[PDB]
Design a protein around this ligand. Structure first.
Ligand SMILES: *[C@@H]1O[C@H](CO[C@@H]2O[C@@H](C)[C@@H](O)[C@@H](O)[C@@H]2O)[C@@H](O[C@@H]2O[C@H](CO)[C@@H](O)[C@H](O)[C@H]2NC(C)=O)[C@H](O)[C@H]1NC(C)=O
Ligand SMILES: *[C@@H]1O[C@H](CO)[C@@H](O[C@@H]2O[C@H](CO)[C@@H](O)[C@H](O)[C@H]2NC(C)=O)[C@H](O)[C@H]1NC(C)=O
Ligand SMILES: *[C@@H]1O[C@H](CO)[C@@H](O[C@@H]2O[C@H](CO)[C@@H](O)[C@H](O)[C@H]2NC(C)=O)[C@H](O)[C@H]1NC(C)=O
Ligand SMILES: *[C@@H]1O[C@H](CO)[C@@H](O[C@@H]2O[C@H](CO)[C@@H](O)[C@H](O)[C@H]2NC(C)=O)[C@H](O)[C@H]1NC(C)=O
Ligand SMILES: *[C@@H]1O[C@H](CO)[C@@H](O[C@@H]2O[C@H](CO)[C@@H](O)[C@H](O)[C@H]2NC(C)=O)[C@H](O)[C@H]1NC(C)=O
Lengths: 238, 41, 315, 45
């Protein structure tokens, strides 16, 4: 909880003071504004006509002569409009791809926990929280990152009684003298028993198998009670 | 005396994985990392 | 990615002609838009390559001894005996995939040279064969490749004891399958046509653009000076304007086609980046995403204007 | 019984078949009980 609180506190600094991100939405706004500005400034061009104002062409020319200049302006402005619309369609397709991706991320990162790697952040996904930005969505991806790694000596299996033992879930490790069974992503040593290991064949096929004893709790309790019963029987006999 | 300098791109650190023959590195702690992902909608 | 180009409207349309450029000025900012579009395409190509290949915090290297439980990665590991430290498969791809400047058309070089792409690919491969999926989700934690492959078998629902007892057979099967990848990449045709298609499409587009300069468009000739020294200024205005309109239409067509093709290449580059994140940096449970069969692992290889994923799966 | 779990009786599942699910604990306890009974019988007579 403390680590998550610290990260969410640092979020407000790693968003607006470090630049980096938040430039995609600003780029979208800038591109749209630039397209509109170029379109509106294309109205001042002449495109070969005497003047860029239709009123000025009409007030100084007879109809038959003004047809040519008005037509030059019409052709130029139609070309500019067509260019604007085509660029807008291409940009709309790009933004639709981005919006489909945002919808997928909301469905899979926020509404559930995602197993897809790097889809919802760098690390193992824990969850995600949405926020709304102008013309966009901002996901805060909470992920779990392994922190302090220690290197142990590992083995693929254990041959205790001539039968190879494989881990049920986790790996065999050794710190130098003793052998434990820990989980994959967090060092939690546990004594290798018959509960967390399964037998598969003898120990003459696996490459790298090591020698260790595997504790059997059932046999331990059975031996204890058998020893007690044998002592009682010996006392009764003599 | 600040100036404009040109270099060749550095792709990151040069870390050689200590891939041994029977050794494994297990993490012993963790971190809760909150990253950000901004998407035009 | 695809070839990043650039055009000079003045050079292309009204090259070294003063009173052709003077009339071109009357068309306004019709040619700042084309310059901005081509700049956007180039920057997007660099972004595509960076997103696909730059997925590694560091540059991982394998240990000097190249024994990984019997799996033989010699054809995909880098070759130090080359100027560009590329793998055998990468060298074959770079040699196989191989195929205007006179008039205003220039070709900009990619930000990441092929050596840097090869280094990135080698980093991803070294991480994925020396640390499994742990190098993509944090710090790189080593694990013997036999144990990592047992992990991956456990991922697809087969108990790990299957791999250990058949380790030699699995290693031989993988070696045989990786040895046939050098022949099946080119002889079978099918794939590898996409990158060559991209290069050929760029060459065709540029050639057509520069060949549009030889069309009259209804003018007396397609040469500015020929119009200049044959007609008086007021009469030559119409012919020069016809040429300007034709060449502007050619340039607009080229830029629009480039924008559409760049959209398609951006979609493909996003897919390739997703495949690198999911197939290479981890193990995928998505069906048919990382090859037919139950996905075990993947290995990237750079190719001219693209990437090649070798998908190892269990059938 | 180690790799199978019990849920209800056999009158609900469609296609449930007959077989003996081996119980290692029961086998070991029965063997020990037989040995103890034989020892007690020998001690008595
Ligand atoms: C791993 O152990 C096996 C088995 O060791 C046997 O059981 C132990 C609990 C202990 O009592 C040992 O003395 C037993 O031998 C080893 O296999 C033995 O190898 C030696 C040397 O070649 C041979 O003389 C014995 O006959 C073998 N015993 C059996 C039961 O096969 C094996 O060598 C050990 N491996 C390693 C790497 O130490
Ligand atoms: C490897 O770990 C084991 C288990 O923690 C260590 O053995 C312990 O040693 C301490 C100190 O003498 C004892 O108090 C414990 O009872 C021991 N535990 C067991 C289960 O025997 C062992 O010392 C460690 N080895 C190294 C090299 O650090
Ligand atoms: C795992 O890492 C956390 C975070 O660094 C460690 O907690 C810190 O411990 C130090 C040393 O006692 C304290 O000064 C910090 O205040 C702690 N941070 C927090 C957020 O509580 C923690 O000790 C580590 N765990 C292990 C087992 O090493
Ligand atoms: C890792 O262990 C394996 C065996 O589990 C080694 O494989 C053989 O090791 C012997 C020496 O013990 C060498 O003479 C052989 O050449 C090795 N086989 C092969 C095919 O090379 C392996 O060498 C060990 N070490 C490393 C660094 O991988
Ligand atoms: C991995 O495969 C390569 C081929 O891709 C093997 O290299 C061959 O080795 C043999 C035996 O020395 C030579 O005759 C060939 O000329 C080599 N081929 C090439 C292309 O160099 C390599 O030996 C394999 N590795 C293992 C461990 O079997």
């Amino acid at each position: 909880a403390n680590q998550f609180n610290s990260a969410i506190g640092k979020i407000q600094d790693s968003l607006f003071s470090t630049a980096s991100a938040l430039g995609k939405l600003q780029d979208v706004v800038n591109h749209n504004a630039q397209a509109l500005n170029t379109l509106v400034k294309q109205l001042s061009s002449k495109f070969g006509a005497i003047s860029s104002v239709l009123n000025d062409i009409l007030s100084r020319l007879d109809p038959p002569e003004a047809e040519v200049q008005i037509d030059r302006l019409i052709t130029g402005r139609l070309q500019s409009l067509q260019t604007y619309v085509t660029q807008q369609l291409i940009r709309a397709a790009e933004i639709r791809a981005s919006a489909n991706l945002a919808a997928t991320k909301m469905s899979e990162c926020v509404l559930g926990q995602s197993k897809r790697v790097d889809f919802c952040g760098k690390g193992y996904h824990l969850m995600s929280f949405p926020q709304s930005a102008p013309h966009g969505v901002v996901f805060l991806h909470v992920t779990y990152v392994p922190a302090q790694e220690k290197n142990f000596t590992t083995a693929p299996a254990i041959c205790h009684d001539g039968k190879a033992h494989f881990p049920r879930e986790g790996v065999f490790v050794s710190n130098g003298t003793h052998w434990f069974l820990t989980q994959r992503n967090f060092y939690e040593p546990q004594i290798i028993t018959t509960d967390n290991t399964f037998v598969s064949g003898n120990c003459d096929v696996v490459i790298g198998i090591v020698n260790n004893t595997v504790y059997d709790p059932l046999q331990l309790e059975l031996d204890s009670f058998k020893e007690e019963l044998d002592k009682y029987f010996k006392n009764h006999t003599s | 005396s600040q100036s404009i300098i040109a270099y060749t791109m550095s792709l990151g650190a040069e870390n050689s994985v200590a891939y041994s023959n029977n050794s494994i590195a297990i993490p012993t702690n963790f971190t809760i990392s909150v990253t950000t992902e901004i998407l035009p909608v | 990615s695809m070839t990043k180009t650039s055009v000079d409207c003045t050079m292309y349309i009204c090259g070294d002609s003063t009173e052709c450029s003077n009339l071109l000025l009357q068309y306004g900012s019709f040619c700042t838009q084309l310059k901005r579009a081509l700049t956007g395409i180039a920057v997007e190509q660099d972004k595509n390559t960076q997103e696909v290949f730059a997925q590694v915090k560091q540059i991982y290297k394998t240990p000097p001894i190249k024994y990984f439980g019997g799996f033989n990665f010699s054809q995909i590991l880098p070759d130090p005996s080359k100027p560009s430290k590329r793998s055998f498969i990468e060298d074959l791809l770079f040699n196989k995939v191989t195929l205007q400047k006179f008039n205003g058309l220039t070709v900009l070089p990619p930000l990441l040279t092929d050596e840097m792409i090869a280094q990135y690919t080698s980093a991803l491969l070294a991480g994925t064969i020396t640390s499994g999926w742990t190098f993509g989700a944090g710090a790189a934690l080593q694990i013997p490749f036999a144990m990592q492959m047992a992990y991956r078998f456990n991922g697809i629902g087969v108990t790990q004891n299957v791999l250990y007892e058949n380790q030699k057979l699995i290693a031989n099967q993988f070696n045989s399958a990786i040895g046939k990848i050098q022949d099946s990449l080119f002889s079978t045709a099918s794939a590898l046509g996409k990158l060559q298609d991209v290069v050929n499409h760029n060459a065709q587009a540029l050639n057509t653009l520069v060949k549009q300069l030889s069309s009259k468009f209804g003018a007396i000739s397609s040469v500015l000076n020929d119009i200049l020294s044959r007609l008086d200024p007021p009469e030559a205005e119409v012919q020069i304007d016809r040429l300007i309109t034709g060449r502007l239409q050619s340039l607009q067509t080229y830029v629009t086609q480039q924008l559409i093709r760049a959209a398609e290449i951006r979609a493909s580059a996003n897919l390739a980046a997703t495949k690198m994140s999911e197939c290479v940096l981890g193990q995928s449970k998505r069906v048919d995403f990382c090859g037919k069969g139950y996905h075990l692992m993947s290995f990237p290889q750079s190719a001219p204007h693209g990437v090649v994923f070798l998908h190892v799966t269990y059938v």
